[PDB]
Every structure is written in C-alpha cells, then in structure tokens.
Design a protein around this motif. Structure first.
Motif, PDB file in Angstrom:
ATOM      1  N   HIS A 113      57.835 -38.202   8.628  1.00 35.60           N
ATOM      2  CA  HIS A 113      58.947 -38.721   9.403  1.00 35.60           C
ATOM      3  C   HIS A 113      58.465 -39.218  10.752  1.00 35.60           C
ATOM      4  CE1 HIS A 113      63.551 -38.232  10.116  1.00 35.60           C
ATOM      5  NE2 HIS A 113      63.092 -39.324  10.693  1.00 35.60           N
ATOM      6  N   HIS A 126      58.054 -42.079  13.672  1.00 39.28           N
ATOM      7  CA  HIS A 126      58.622 -43.284  14.276  1.00 39.28           C
ATOM      8  C   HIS A 126      57.433 -43.835  15.043  1.00 39.28           C
ATOM      9  CE1 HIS A 126      63.117 -43.055  14.081  1.00 39.28           C
ATOM     10  NE2 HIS A 126      62.825 -41.826  13.706  1.00 39.28           N
ATOM     11  N   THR A 134      62.844 -45.276  11.263  1.00 42.96           N
ATOM     12  CA  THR A 134      61.452 -45.294  10.825  1.00 42.96           C
ATOM     13  C   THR A 134      61.258 -46.533   9.947  1.00 42.96           C
ATOM     14  OG1 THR A 134      62.015 -43.783   8.966  1.00 42.96           O
ATOM     15  CG2 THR A 134      61.063 -42.787  10.905  1.00 42.96           C
ATOM     16  N   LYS A 175      62.989 -47.059   4.142  1.00 46.24           N
ATOM     17  CA  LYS A 175      63.868 -46.173   4.882  1.00 46.24           C
ATOM     18  C   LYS A 175      65.270 -46.761   4.921  1.00 46.24           C
ATOM     19  CE  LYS A 175      65.506 -43.127   7.787  1.00 46.24           C
ATOM     20  NZ  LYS A 175      64.820 -42.938   9.062  1.00 46.24           N
ATOM     21  N   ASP A 183      60.059 -36.323  13.259  1.00 43.22           N
ATOM     22  CA  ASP A 183      61.065 -37.333  13.633  1.00 43.22           C
ATOM     23  C   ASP A 183      60.589 -37.699  15.045  1.00 43.22           C
ATOM     24  OD1 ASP A 183      63.263 -39.060  13.805  1.00 43.22           O
ATOM     25  OD2 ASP A 183      64.755 -37.524  13.404  1.00 43.22           O
ATOM     26  N   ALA A 204      62.244 -39.368  18.417  1.00 43.49           N
ATOM     27  CA  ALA A 204      63.578 -39.809  18.012  1.00 43.49           C
ATOM     28  C   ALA A 204      64.307 -38.571  17.487  1.00 43.49           C
ATOM     29  CB  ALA A 204      63.469 -40.864  16.917  1.00 43.49           C
TER      30      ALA A 204
HETATM   31 NI    NI Z   1      64.015 -40.534  12.465  1.00 41.09          NI
END
Ligand code: NI
Ligand code: NI
Ligand code: NI
Ligand code: NI
Ligand code: NI
Ligand code: NI
Lengths: 551, 101, 100, 551, 551, 100
Positions: free
Chosen positions: A133, A135, A168, A216, A344, A347
């Motif tokens: 995950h 970004h 993403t 995504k 993540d 983000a």
């Molecule tokens: Ni995300």
C-alpha cells in the motif's frame, strides 16, 4: 567434550528449548529445532572453523555457496529454527548445516574459497517485508522502508501530486513508463498499480500492457459498481490484482452493493476497518467473504489512548473514524480474520512502521487475550508465525509475487533481514537485497573499526549503481513482459512477472484464513462475531517506542 | 499587509446558467447516511434514496462543482437538478444507461 | 544509536528551533521559518514528556503570540503539524491557528 | 445556483476582477480572464468532479492528457489568466477548460483514466526560469537554482578552476565532452558556452562542433577587437550566440571601439551596467543599440543601503563600482532598456536569487516611480509581464532555445513552477520538469501525511536516473547534432538544437525593447537619457527577505 | 626589470633556494629547481598573461593542452621543483614552461583556446595517494579517502559482513562481479583482492579470471604453508600480487616456516610490525628479505602516549600489541626498511589518515634522529622524498599499476592533489581525478563568490555519472581483460590491466630498499639491527592534529 | 519551513559555532575551524539584528583575539566571509584579518 547450555548460547546463539524475548515486548519465542551437529558448528574468525581444509573446502565456485549466514535463528511462517543459511546466485540455496564435507558430517551447505560469511549467532533472521500500500509521494520513502526491514514496495503514484496524495495510482502509459524507469534507482523491489477507475476496458488494458501489476480502484476517482466491474473483468483476463478503497459516501450504494458488483471475484480490500476509507460504517464486514483478501493500514494499529484524537484532525469524519471498529480490528488480526498489514504511506499511514506496529498489536493482544487456541507449549510461537505472515508471505500471495519473494524458502530471492533480539522489529542489524547487503548501521567512516559513534543507517554496495540493478526486481504484468516493455524502456534491473493473482482466496492466506460471521450495528457501530461483541482496550504505553527513538 | 492576500471584488457568481433544471423531493429510506456529489448521475444514486428516478434521468445536482448533499437516514428534502451537457452520454455509475441520453 | 533517516531528519528540526530560540531570547520578532521551527520543537519535547495529543494541540497555541512575530507571519501559518514518539508510539499533532 | 465571490475564490481560486498581492511586495495582479464555465470547474477529491463518468471520461490514453493542473492562475508575458493546463508527452498540450466532453460543455482538455491531477486552485503557475549566466563552479548550483524556480541553465565551466571562477567558459572539445556527459546527471536543461577568445577561427569552430551553443568572450582571456571579431564571424556562420564581458581596462580601446569591432552583429552583453565587468565607466551605453541584447547580473539588483559597501570589498575598483550606474540600472530595467536578468553564479552573483531579485526591483520601482505609462486598470499587470519576461522568454530568445522553453505556450517543454501567492518568487510549492515533479517541499517521510515538519526541499522522481534523462534537455549546436556528438558521447538525455541566435535583435525582446538615447558622464559617471538624469534611491528594507529565510 | 625575492614569492610562489614549512611540522622543503624564464611566468586574470595573442596562442586543440596548472611547486619522489604542469587527454602531458611560442621563449606546454587554467602559485602539487589495504566495509570510505588525497584504493570486501570486517577479501566470481559493477559508482581508481586461502589452484584461478588483481591470504581463513604455497603458485602464473596477514597463533609453524613456504617468491606483507596481525612476536623480521615488500597500517604510526592503551582494548593481545616493535617501526620507516604505508580501513586502521600519519612519523623522526645520512643541504628534501614514496610510487609498483598511476610523470593518469602549504597533508585545496576536479572545498552555493562560509568538501563534476566513468580506472587482471569481463559485466569506467607484480623486489622500492639484519628477542620483544637496539620515544603532542580538526 | 539548500547549509555553520562557543567558554584556545565558525556565526546574527555590512566588517575583528586561539591560527585566517539575509536582502560580509 561437554559445554553448559548458557556458555553454548553465548557462543553459538540459543538452541532447542531456549526462549528469547522479542525486543521489549511480552512475546517470547522458543527454538523449535536446530539443524546442527553439536561440536560441528561453523564459526568465523582467528583460529576458528571456517579456514582452508577445515570448515572451508576445496570446491570450485559452482559447487559452493556465495554467502553463508552462520548459526541463524530463523523466524518465518513455517518455523522458528536454528540453522545455517546458504545463498547462491542471489537466491536462497539451502537452510541446513554449513561446512566442509571433507572433514565434517551432515554438511548440506558447502563453504569454499568463493564463500563470504555473515556471522548470525545470537541474531534472528527473517524474510524482507512487503508493503503493498505505497503512495509514491516521494522517493525518500524507499530508504525509510528499507531501513525498517521492508524490501518490496507495491503501490502507485507520480510524486507529490494531488492524485497521488490521495490514491495509489500511476495514471496511464506515460507516467507508468516514467515510474518504471525511476524504479531502477531505488534499492527495493517494485511493482506499480494503475488507475482502475474507468468503465471502458481498453483504457485499463493499455495500463496493464504498459507495465502495472495491478489496478487501484479508489473512491476519489469514483468507486462505482460500473468501474469496479470493469476493473475486475480486465483483472480476470490479464492475471493482475485489484485493490479497493470503496465508496465511503454510500453514494452509488451500500457495502452490500459493492460486494454484489465484485461478484465473487478476487480482490484485495485496503484498510478494511474503514478509518482509511470505505463504506461507512460497515466495510469491515468484507472479511467474511472467501474472495476478499483483507489488509489494514498502520495508523490504527494498535488501538491506543491518543488514536481517536489524532485521527479526527488527520482525516462526516465521525462516521469514518469509529472507536468501535478501531478496537475490533486488533482482535480480528489476532484471530486471523485480517490477513495483511501495510502502511498507506504519507496518506494516513507510516512507511517505516509497518513491521513495528504489527508486533505492537501482537504484544497488546497477548497481554489482553492470552494464548491463542492454536498455541502449543509455553511460548508465543504460533502468534508470532501468524503475525509475521501478515507482512511477508500473505502480501506476496495477494499480489502474485510469492514465487520470487515473501519468505525464506529455497529458490526465492535472498531478501533477508538480520536482527539483534533486543532491537527486533525496530532497528535491523543488516538488510540484504538479492544476496548483497544494501543498507546497515555504520559508525565513524574514519574509525579504526566500524563500531564507533555516530552509528546511523548508510547505503551499502547493494544500493549502488549496477550492483543495485542486479539485486532488485521490477515486477511486470505478463502482457508488459511479452510486449518487450523492459527492452523498450531500457530497464536495467532484473525483471519478474506476476502470476496467480486471480486464484488466491482467503483460504490461501497463511495462518490468517478466518471467515467470521461478523456484523456491524448501523447505529452504534458495534462489531459482533457470531453475536458476541468484539472489542479491546486502548494502550497507554507501548513497547518498541520511547526506549529506541531519539524523537 | 498580508503576504499573498486576495482582494476579491464583492458580488456573486451565477452557476450553470442557461441550462434546464428541475426540483425533486428525495427521501433516504436506508439506515446509513448517503452523500451525493455535484456531478454524479442522480438517476443512478444509491437505491435507498427514494424519488422519481425517471425525472432525474440525465441530471446532476445544481450545486457548486466539487460539493455534495448529504442525506442522513430517514431524511427527506427537495433538491434542484441541472441537466448534463456535452454529448449527454452517460457511462459508469450503476451501469444503467452506458450510452447517450 | 542506529539512527534511522526520520530520527536524523528531526535533528534538523531541533537545530532550526535552537536558532529561533536564541533570537526570541534577544527580543526579535520571529519570521516564518523561525516560528514554525520553535512551535514544532515544543511539541516534540511535549511528546517526550508523555503529554497527550489533546493537551499539546492546545498548549501549542500559546508558545508565540502575534506580538512576538513579524507582520503577516500568523496568516502564513494556518496550522502546524509534527509527529513524535509518544509513550504509545508515533502520533500526529496538529495545532490550528497556533499564533494569535 | 449562486455562490458569493469570496466563497468562490476560496474554493476555486480568484476569478476575473479579483486582485492578488505578490508575496509581501506592493505588486498586485488582477485576473484578466477566466477560461472556465461557472459550475463546470474540475476539482479532485472524495465526492468531487474528477471521477469516472463525471469529470473523467472513457477515452484511451492517446485521446487525453497525462497531467492536468486544475484552476491555475497563469502569470506569463502574454497574460494573467485563470485556466486549466493540459500536459501531454512532457509538453504543454493546451490552456483551456478540462473535463469530460460526455457530460460537460466547452471541454478542450480531456481527462481520462490516464490522467494525473495537480490541484492548482489558489496557486500561481509560471514557466520555469532561464539563467544564461552560469559559472559551472560546482554541480550543487543546479539544485539551488531548481529550488528557486529556474529550470534551464546556460553557462560554462569545468568546476572550481581559476578559469571558471572568473569566466563562463568550458575550454575545448575534451572539457566540453566531459561536461556534456556530466550534464545528464543534473535535473535542469543545460547548454554550454565555450572560450571565444581567439583570433584563429578554426579553434572556435572545433568547440562549436564539439557541442557548445555559444561562445563567451571574457576580458580575462583578452576581450580585444581581433578576438571579438573572430568570435562573431564564427557565430554568424554556425548560428550560435556570443556573450560579452568587455575590456574594463580600456586597454585595446574604449567602449566605442568594442562597439565598432562588433559591427552591428548580434551579441548578448553580460552585466551591461558594468560592476560585474566591462568598459569603465560607460559599458551601459550599449543598451542603445539594436543588435545588443542586454542583461544584468543580480548582486546590483536592486540598489540598497549595503550595496556599495559589499561590492567594493567583493571586487581601480572605484571605477568599476559606481553608485551612479548602479542606481540607473534599476530604472533602465523598469523602462525596458535592459531585457534580461541573470545570476553570474559564484562570480559576483547569486544562483538562487535571479527570480527573487527581479521582483524586488519591480517592487522598488513601483514604490518610487508609480505606474508605468503602459499600465491599464488599477493593477500592476503590465509591470509584472515586463519583469517576468526578463528571466523566461527573453533569455530563451537571446540564446536560440525559445522553440523549446521560456513560456507557457503549446508545444513547449512542460517546465512549470507552482507558487502559493504568499511565497511567490521566494519558495515554490512544486517545480515540474518535462512533465514530472522534479523537486518540491516535503515533510516527514515517515509521517501519516506529507505535511508534518520538518518541511524542506527534496528531489522527487523527475530528478531520478532514467526518468530525469527523459525530462531534461541538453542543448547542442546544429553542427554538434549533425556530427553525432550525442551518439559518440552516449548522452542519455533528450537533445535539443539551438537556432535563430543571429536574427534576434533588441526589438524582439518581449516588453523590453527600448533603445534609449543614453549617455554617461566620463567624470561624474552620471547617466542621462535624452539629457534627463536617471537615478533612484537605495532601499533600507526589501520584501522577499527576512520574513522568509532562516539565515 | 628587477623584483625583490619576497614580492616574487608572493606573486608566483617560491623559487630556487626558498624554503617552505610543511603544515605545522618541523619539516622544511627547499625548491631545488625552477623551470621558468624569469619575466615569462604565465598568470591568469584580468590584464594578466594568459590572454589571446599573449600567453595564449592560436593553435587547435590537438596542439595544446586541455589543462595547465600554473607555477606549481611539485613534491614527488624524483624532485621538489617549481614548474607548470600540462594535462592532455586526462594524462600528464609535460612538466615544463607553459605559454605561447609565438611571443614567449622556451615554451614546452602550449596554451590555446582549448586550455583551462588552475592557478597553482603558492601551492604544492603532489600525485594522488594509493592505499593498498582497503576493507570494503562501506562505500563511504571512498569519499573519505578522496578528500584526504588518496585517489586509488586497492582492497577487498563485500560490505559490512564478518568476512570483510576481518579480511580484505572479495570471495568468488559472484561477489567479484558485483563489486566490479559497484566500483563504477565510486570516484577513485579501484582494484580488487580475492580470497587466496585455498589449497586447490583452480579455485584461485577462477577468482583471478573473474577480475581480481591480487589474492589476500589472511589467517582468519587459514594462513597455512599449504594455502600460502598455492596462492603464490597461481600468482606466479597469472601475474597478480599476493598480500599476506600471517599466522599470529604460530599454529602451523613460526615465522621462519611461513618464510620457507613463500620460498623466495614476491609477496606484499601487510602490517609487517605485527600489531595488525602476523607471527607473534617476530613477523617484523620479514623486512630483511629481498622478495618481501613490507608495509605498515596506520594506527601504530607514529608511536604516541595513548597508542598502547587504545590498541589493547581495540584488538594473547599482550603478545600482539608490543611497545618494543611499535617504537621500532617508526625508525624502520625512517631508514627505508619499511616501504609502504596504508590504512587497513575500519579493521585496525583509519581510511582518511594514511597521508597525515606518514608525515607525522617523518616529523617525529626528524625531531628525534635529526638529518638522514642521505640529506644534502639545510633542508629535509631527502626525508620528504623517502616518505612521499611510501604512499604513491611504492604501492603502485607493489601492485603492478605503476604504469598508470603513482607519480607525476608524463603519460600517467592525471590524478593530482593541490595543497596550500599551511594545510599540506591535512586538507587539500583541490583533488583532480583523470584530468577533472573530483572533490574540493566549497563555500556557500548561493554566495556571490565560492569562498563564503560554510566551506566543506563537496563532490564536483569529475565525480558525476559519465564524467566520473571517464576519469577513473578499474584495474583488472590480464586474464579478466582477455576474457572480456568488462564487456560481460558492462563496466562503464576506463579499464587498466596490472602487470609486473612478480618481478618487483625490495630493491625496486623507491628510496626504501633497505634490507637490515634485524632480530627480535623472543622473550623481551626487543628489536635489534646489527645488534644495536632500535627504539624511539612516544609523542605527547603531534602536528597535523588539534589545530585543524573540529572534532 | 520550506528550507532551501542554502538555509540547511547555514544550519551546519551555526552548529559548528555552537561547538566552538562551548569550548571558548571552558577557557580553551580555539583552533582553526572553531575560530572560523565562531566569527562567521556572529556575523549572521548581526545581519538578523539588522546591523549594516560596514558595522559588521569592523565588529567582526573583535570577536576573538590572538590570546584566545592556538599558535598560527591568526595567520591561517587572512579574512572571513559569510553571507546572510539583511533587511535589504543577502549581502556578503568580508572581515579582513579578524584575529589580532
Ligand atoms: Ni492509500
Ligand atoms: Ni485508501
Ligand atoms: Ni563577467
Ligand atoms: Ni560571469
Ligand atoms: Ni590483517
Ligand atoms: Ni586488514
């Protein structure tokens, strides 16, 4: 002769029956097996074993390993065992007994003139982590992740642009090509995700053919039933994975509508608890389905005293950030209902804390719930295997790259992390990429020895130019590989193709295949499994925190 | 002195001028809140929202671009809709039209 | 010490705050970077002490006043954010309109 | 419906009639036009416009842009307008209205699955700056310049060597080749200048054929009439530009003699005011001629209280550093007699202050002289267009690269700089090179979001390896391009050829074509235009200074 | 006309008869010769000599040098002379008189339009140093060494691995290949050593064929008579060098046994004094033999008050660390019995202190023993030539690379170091690699000049991408070169082959060929040469220390 | 803060001066780098205060004396130069023979 167990542990690391505390947590592992022959352990140094005619043989390079990690305590999904690890051609050659067959017995990992040695006695060795995950907001994230023990990064982005800040996604062939080219510069394995939000199949096929290994679907680009269906149809025909961040607004429908659109097809649900995005407030019910591979992002792991406060201002928000689902999430991980952990990055997630937070959850769960039903013996071995699988083999299976990375098994890329027990999960001693050390703590460059202060992480030879290209992998879709994308873009790194993304299901997630009959109260947000309430208490203090960090 | 300050002239901006509009009473019959964006094809919103879907065909919310209208469970309210322009071809959403109209 | 990249990055923030701190001590009206650095470092130490996120979100709005900074500075800083290792791990502190 | 103007500005940025203050200066710009259709503005985010079937269409990559900068306030030589900017294949595709033609009206920039988004509402977007007076003393200058908003650097040098410390010359084929190779490593567009001081044409032709796009004539190598004539003859036949730093000593003749040697041929005069070098004390009179393209170096811009003091010890000196000409220079810029601004990096100039100083001069001139005769309306729009042209389009025209860079016009390389109004000209929000973000402010790498402290400029994906090569240009002379220099040196970046260096004249300099009847008193050094005295007062305090910098 | 000697020295640097103090030591050098014609010295600058038609001629690039270092005071093994240095095609072209033959007399180094200039008046210029005892524990060592004035690094390793921490060995073809590839990224010339500890010749031949230029025999891998003999046999047939760290434990035999195994074949003995490893306590007796090329590692140089204390805890130890042999070592260097100095980087040695420590020993020896028997005149010229040879030409001869580097002689690679006299041996003014400045002190990047604070070492253009590849050399064995290893691994840097490693003997070491009749008392460890006791006193304070370093 | 490369570079100078400052406080005779760092940092703060270039060129020659530094140090430093943001922008200050 004879030697006492304590002196033995001090010299070669612990053996069968000894227990080791993981960092400053309450988790203890017990050595389940030892592959050595007592008295024949290989040790390197002046007057030691690995010397010509002794522990080192006369074989040519082809008949011996390039690198041997001696007396390692392996912690993997399949076992917690003491053994020597052999590495050849950048891949795991064997887990067994190293030495010279000319004078030693039971040698399975031959050491010769062409063999380098890493002394792992007293150290815990694990596979490199896999964060699915990411970004790609900035390239600095790679070093941060590598230092934490993560060696493969899957995600999407083009840099600090609004689209990437939120999703993403690497949109289109041009940006995909540019990012595949930029990837050669980073010391981690990389796979890219494209923008899957479209109702025209060809716009998706182009992206897959350009190089993405997944698509995504994010609500910011419209997570509608039409878009979801379109992405899954293409995924089914091109053997790539789909990651989902559902419709939090319940604009196009509720969670049951999204699930209906998915129609039993394989899909990886991002931050399944909901705080990071998803149908408010019951996206968490997705973990009950056989075709859903559920993961959590890390800021909610584990539930602590400051969690709700920070999340609210970090983020209608009151419908997304729920104490009820946040507390339940930790338990669902402990039961194996949630199968992966991820960041993540930048983000609503911390790129250097995927591993650290996974262990903090395990600690908090042991403290609150005690031993798992699966535990055997007076140790936490099973809970440790269940949790390490969340950031190693399970993410690899979910994205179709388990044939290359994800665990310490023969034939897989030699992405390994060496840890001193006192710093397990926090600060690695050595991070190896494809057979070469890529980053490690290093003291004064001008010092007489490598240990004087200041000691801080610095890039090693495995992170340099052409050596780096030879020790990292860029994952491509089968279509991109066939179209000659690597040759066209003149990619310098080793290439790997993803496969088996459509056939993985919840039952395939190692030690995390539970499909609970879970419900969420629309009004109270309470989570119940089989009618029983699932909840936990917030921590006031956590291990792997203030004792290790300067800030 | 405030660095980079604006000196916005007073008044108002008329949005989506010269376009067909219509009002519709909408009621949320679901048990969970529903929020609709400015450009979503209103006729294909979450099924729990009860209204004349036939009248909302080819329409979106007549609200400033980027904003949304929220409907708590049981909430009933009248909204103003404005017709789509361009080619008036709808693709996506719940997959009900997938073509012109 | 085995300092990770993030720990070293924070050393930069700490040092920037040392600069600001000495200037405020001389009686100067702080500029934009000095103000951000000073308030940010205050929060990090707050977390080291074990204060809660909620408490720091409030205390952070009382480090500098409009009369201790240059004109236009308060409007250039709508909020200040910083993360630090609290007893319960890394947490983000957001101080809204820190200067008034 | 209806929306108030203030709420509108807060949501989509200002529109027609609104004014914006540039940083902390007294300069105000007024939006002249807005290319949107009120109610159809594209905004990205949860529940916003750019989503499947809505603001995002179903077209394939070939029929949509790769990147869209939404709701940008463009400040360029041709206008100050509100619009969406489309970027495709690394170049400016269109300035217009972005969206999906399926449901929106007047769409000229189609957004599809392959489109990335940069939210520019509330931001000012400008072309990247062009510094044509670079001394390649060190490679670190490139990052410093890029961070300031300069994307193209033209100059000469070989590193910290005496020749380079003093002159912008890359001497000979060997050093030229080495520097063209080194250029692939830098994130800015680059063109090199060779040593033009020779009286043998072939020694110059060799350098041009090796790759230089111009020849620097510097007094330290002998700025004699013979050398000047030789360089111009070669420039005339090979279509390259000549930059001049004249004979300060008046050794071979006076300014009129140098002008006579030039003989009406096109030439770029460096630091035309004189402090940075040139016939003492009247080199400034060159701005009266039609074939002279005059620029200023930045330490004298603008005239302040500490200027003379620092210059004297920084540097007979009393004949080079003159208060009279230093004060007049600011006014000559305001009138359009001087057409370019540049640095003269680390050789009596500051590489990261070309843009910043240009705006400080504009501010000081508005404060002292009021509105320009060309101003229309109650804004500073014309003065802003006149000054931005000094470091963007004019330097591009002077060096024959205006077909590639220099302004925001379709077909040109997408070198763009995004600025928050409060930090305009001081600290950019995003610097885009060839369609990819190359450097930008970035907070804590491990943070949950990209904004937490400390925030400082860090290299992005556009500055990495192969992505960088694809997003930057190395300028070559037509002869070098034809000789296959790029293939021979194995240059990896995109190549561009310079052309039209001989045909540009003072009349072609955008908004800065004045040819004043200017005189300099040999004894008093007083500058007069049409007999009237040109002068100004030194500033005690300037904007874009202590409010923004830590040191 | 006439000019006083002091004003002359201030303008062009010292001339014949003038003396210069080396840093803050007691060593003084006297200019032995000056190759100029008084009145015809070339100086660069406004109104100076190097200008068109004057000191700069009309010749094409092929007939002039690319770079000229003006008025340099050369300190090399062959002389201490004042002259201009010409560099062409990255190599030393000539040492003589620079200028234009059209108007000047005795010009041997023609300056033309294609010539760059480095002003060396008042500076001391030396060849780049050569460290032949590198442990490739981390890549950061290269920058540290380069900054100190070392331009060639020979050693072995794979990064921070146990084998490398202890030995200078790059084990096997795989690691050798990876390290040759990584070498392209480093700004220094590099040659690798393989693991020579094996009793099977083919396992050694494979490594040589893979690219190593030598084989390290280290006791940690077993420095047995069998292994030693095997490595020397292969070295004799493949023309590569062998480096030895003998059996400290006297396990397989005593020093005489090892010497017997060597059997008169050429070999480089590492840290011959013993503290860094070797037969306890008489490995030092090896310097008496004609086939032994002896070197010292730097922590024991020179003997000071804190030496024994630190060494003991840095390291049975009492048999390895001996005050007697440590004190004798300094004297043996002064007499020319020990011929090389090296570091033993991060394995009982300091990578940035090879040069600095060599001069501290010279200082301490002058202070204690006075003038050498070879000294002529009232200067320290001979002692200076004897010592500079220890880290330049002698290491080059020992490893078969003296045809490429090691001294300032025509045809050799232009690896040069420019020093201000006050900082000689401590902090260089400019480090040139292959004709381009690779690293140098650099002030504020945004400053108006390159001198404002803070001034610290920063990489220059010669250290960047392709320019770097063109200015550095990767040394290969003759077999590797013939096998096409460079093409197979796609090495980008210039390649050089080693030769003449088997034929060098103690008599070939410049100014350091003494073969003393030395003995070591087995009980007392006392060192005697011809029966006389060799010893010295420990320093309480040394030059080139606290006056220059911040920490 | 949006620190540019030059701002971060100056943080290095400031920190080097902190080292020197503490050593002078202990009564040590400063060495070469310590002396350059101390005087340089003094000038930067002078500019932050709003002093003129002319004033700093003079004041800078009175920060350290020959008796507060090691032998040979004054001769190793013929001048010290540093730039800082004055109220009227960046200016270069050159202090000739700062130590006497
Ligand atoms: Ni995300
Ligand atoms: Ni998400
Ligand atoms: Ni000039
Ligand atoms: Ni210049
Ligand atoms: Ni050794
Ligand atoms: Ni060694």
């Amino acid at each position: 002769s004879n030697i006492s167990r304590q002196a033995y542990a001090d010299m070669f690391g612990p053996t069968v029956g000894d227990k080791v505390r993981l960092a400053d947590t309450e988790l203890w592992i017990e050595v389940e097996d030892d592959l050595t022959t007592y008295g024949e352990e290989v040790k390197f140094g002046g007057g030691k074993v690995i010397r010509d005619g002794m522990g080192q043989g006369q074989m040519l390079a082809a008949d011996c390993v390039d690198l041997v990690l001696t007396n390692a305590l392996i912690v993997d999904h399949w076992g917690i065992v003491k053994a020597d690890i052999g590495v050849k051609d950048g891949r795991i050659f064997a887990i067994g007994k190293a030495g010279n067959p000319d004078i030693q017995p039971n040698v399975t990992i031959p050491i010769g003139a062409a063999t380098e040695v890493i002394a792992a006695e007293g150290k815990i060795v694990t596979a490199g982590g896999i964060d699915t995950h990411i970004h790609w907001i900035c390239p600095q994230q790679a070093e941060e992740a590598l230092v934490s023990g993560v060696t493969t990064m899957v995600g999407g982005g083009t840099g600090p642009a609004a689209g990437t800040h939120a999703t993403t996604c690497t949109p289109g062939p041009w940006y995909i090509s540019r990012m595949l080219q930029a990837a050669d510069s980073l010391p981690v394995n990389i796979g890219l995700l494209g923008k899957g939000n479209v109702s025209q199949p060809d716009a998706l096929r182009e992206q897959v053919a350009a190089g993405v290994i997944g698509l995504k679907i994010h609500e910011d680009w419209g997570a509608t039933p039409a878009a979801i269906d379109c992405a899954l149809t293409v995924a089914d025909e091109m053997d790539i994975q789909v990651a989902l961040h559902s419709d939090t607004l319940n604009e196009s429908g509720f969670v049951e509508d999204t699930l209906a659109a998915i129609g039993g097809r394989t899909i990886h649900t991002f931050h399944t608890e909901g705080a990071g995005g998803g149908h408010a407030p019951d996206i968490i019910t997705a973990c009950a389905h056989p075709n859903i591979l559920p993961s959590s992002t890390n800021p909610t792991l584990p539930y602590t005293l400051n969690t709700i406060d920070e999340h609210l201002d970090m983020l209608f928000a009151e419908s997304r950030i729920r104490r009820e689902t946040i507390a339940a999430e930790d338990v669902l991980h402990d039961l194996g209902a949630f199968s992966l952990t991820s960041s993540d990055s930048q983000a609503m997630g911390r790129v250097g804390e995927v591993i650290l937070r996974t262990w903090q959850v395990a600690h908090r769960m042991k403290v609150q719930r005690g031993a798992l039903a699966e535990e055997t013996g007076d140790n936490d071995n099973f809970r440790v295997k269940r949790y390490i699988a969340k950031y190693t083999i399970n993410p690899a299976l979910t994205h179709g790259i388990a044939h290359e990375v994800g665990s310490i098994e023969v034939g897989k890329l030699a992405d390994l992390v060496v840890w001193s027990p006192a710093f397990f999960g926090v600060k690695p001693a050595t991070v190896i990429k494809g057979g070469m050390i890529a980053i490690a703590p290093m003291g004064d460059i001008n010092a007489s020895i490598p240990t004087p202060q200041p000691v801080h992480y610095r890039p090693m030879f495995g992170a340099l130019g052409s050596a780096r290209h030879h020790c990292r992998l860029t994952f491509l879709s089968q279509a991109a590989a066939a179209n000659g994308v690597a040759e066209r873009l003149n990619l310098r790194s080793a290439i790997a193709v993803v496969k088996g993304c459509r056939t993985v299901q919840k039952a395939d997630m190692v030690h995390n295949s539970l499909q609970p009959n879970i419900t969420v109260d629309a009004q109270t947000y309470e989570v119940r499994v089989d009618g029983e309430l699932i909840t936990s208490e917030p921590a006031d203090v956590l291990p792997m925190a203030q004792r290790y960090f300067l800030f | 002195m405030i660095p980079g300050e604006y000196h916005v002239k007073p008044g108002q901006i008329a949005l989506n001028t010269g376009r067909a509009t219509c009002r519709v009473v909408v009621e949320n019959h679901g048990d969970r809140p529903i929020q609709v964006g400015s450009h979503y094809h209103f006729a294909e919103v979450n099924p729990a929202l009860k209204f004349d879907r036939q009248q909302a065909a080819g329409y979106r919310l007549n609200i400033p671009a980027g904003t949304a209208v929220r409907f708590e469970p049981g909430q009933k309210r009248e909204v103003e809709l404005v017709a789509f322009a361009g080619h008036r071809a709808v693709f996506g959403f719940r997959g009900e039209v997938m073509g012109p109209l | 010490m085995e300092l990770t990249p993030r720990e070293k990055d924070k050393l930069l923030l700490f040092t920037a705050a040392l600069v600001a701190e000495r200037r405020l001590a001389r009686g100067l009206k702080l500029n934009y970077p000095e103000s951000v650095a000073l308030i940010s470092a205050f929060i990090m130490e707050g977390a080291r002490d074990g204060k809660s996120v909620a408490s720091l979100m409030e205390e952070g709005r009382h480090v500098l006043t409009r009369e201790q900074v240059m004109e236009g500075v308060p409007e250039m800083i709508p909020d200040i954010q910083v993360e630090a290792t609290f007893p319960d791990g890394s947490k983000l502190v957001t101080v809204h309109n820190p200067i008034i």
